[PDB]
Design a protein around this ligand. Structure first.
Ligand code: ANP
Ligand code: MG
Length: 330
């Protein structure tokens, strides 16, 4: 059904030691070396707190995991250990657990983050090109290591704007890419789910992350959050269809031999492609460029195989200002 355009063989080249997270022995740190200070975040399967590594008296983040299954915890630790030292990936400090209840926690570095609703409007056209390019660097890295984030979204992209640093967090939905594996379609957030998730296509790959990157980016440059605002998973496909059109939806379904569920014929309707230029307004005009639109259009495609790769996106003309600045700076 589907094999990824790039990095399909990475898990085969790296060993079983690289992806067999079931057989992982965790060298737990000392729970009592960490003191929890204040709650800074929460998730469906987690609670997050700013904390102190007491021996060093240094700030960090402790994420208390509620296990869906023990195996899921091994996957997240395995992936963080594997991605260590990679550009703009959140740094893993420790894994610990309570001795009595055996509840685990992950200790990562603290990032001084501004809420995206507050931070995104403050950005210039250059900032967006720079921060999206920094995010590409992570996506490319972890894709090149045979890993899919599967929850790329603003909430899992911490940015310190004074430092001009970016870290991708929340690897709890990250899974290893094995060619032809049916993966679970109940991944990502509603507004960043890819068309493949919405139609229950299971043989997806690292391109899922690029569609979501495009939802994110479209949100920044059009100043609309979220860009695709479906009320449920069915409405989410309808909202995507009203922009991309259903002429290209049907050839994509036909191309991938997906029969749509019967619920959709009642609500899907018939829609023409809405051009990207109709989303341009006075408020979001600063972000708008002909490079930005072209770049967005090569992310937001029904067919995952037509999406730009993270490596390909970096060479896009939209980022050339970012590349030029970095070359001249050094
Ligand atoms: N390194 C960090 N620095 C600063 N804040 C962080 C850091 N890691 C996590 N947070 C905050 O904690 C929140 C929740 O973290 P996250 O790991 O996404 O939790 P979760 O339980 O997996 N939530 P969800 O994404 O909904 O599945 C984030 O949205 C951040 O605001
Ligand atoms: Mg999670």
């Amino acid at each position: 059904r589907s094999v990824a355009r790039v990095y399909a063989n990475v898990n085969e080249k790296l060993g079983r030691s690289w992806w067999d997270y079931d057989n992982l022995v965790v060298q737990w740190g000392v729970q009592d070396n960490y003191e929890i200070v204040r709650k800074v975040g929460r998730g469906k399967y987690s609670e997050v707190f700013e904390s102190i590594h007491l021996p060093t008296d240094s700030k960090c983040i402790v994420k208390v995991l509620k296990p869906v299954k023990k195996k899921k915890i091994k996957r997240e630790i395995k992936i963080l250990q594997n991605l260590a030292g990679g550009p703009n990936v959140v740094g893993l400090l420790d894994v610990v657990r309570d001795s009595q209840s055996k509840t685990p926690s992950i200790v990562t570095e603290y990032v001084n983050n501004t809420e995206f609703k507050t931070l995104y409007p403050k950005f210039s056209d250059f900032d967006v090109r720079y921060y999206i390019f920094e995010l590409l660097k992570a996506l490319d890295f972890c894709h090149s290591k045979g890993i899919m984030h599967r929850d790329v979204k603003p909430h899992n992209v911490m940015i310190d704007h004074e430092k001009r640093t970016l870290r991708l967090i929340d690897w709890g939905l990250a899974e290893f890419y094995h060619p032809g594996t049916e993966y679970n379609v109940r991944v990502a957030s509603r507004y960043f789910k890819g068309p493949e998730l919405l139609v229950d296509f299971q043989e997806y790959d690292y391109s899922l992350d690029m569609w979501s990157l495009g939802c994110m980016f479209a949100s920044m440059i059009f100043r609309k959050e979220p860009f695709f605002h479906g009320h449920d998973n069915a409405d989410q496909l309808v909202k995507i269809a009203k922009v991309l059109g259903t002429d290209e939806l049907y050839t994509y379904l036909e191309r991938y031999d997906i029969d749509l569920d019967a619920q959709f014929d009642d609500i899907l309707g018939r829609y023409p492609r809405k051009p990207w230029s109709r989303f341009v307004s006075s408020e979001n005009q600063r972000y708008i460029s002909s490079e930005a639109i072209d770049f967005l259009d090569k992310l937001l495609r029904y067919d995952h195989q037509e999406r730009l790769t993270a490596e390909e996106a970096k060479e896009h003309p939209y980022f050339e200002p970012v590349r030029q600045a970095a070359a001249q700076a050094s």
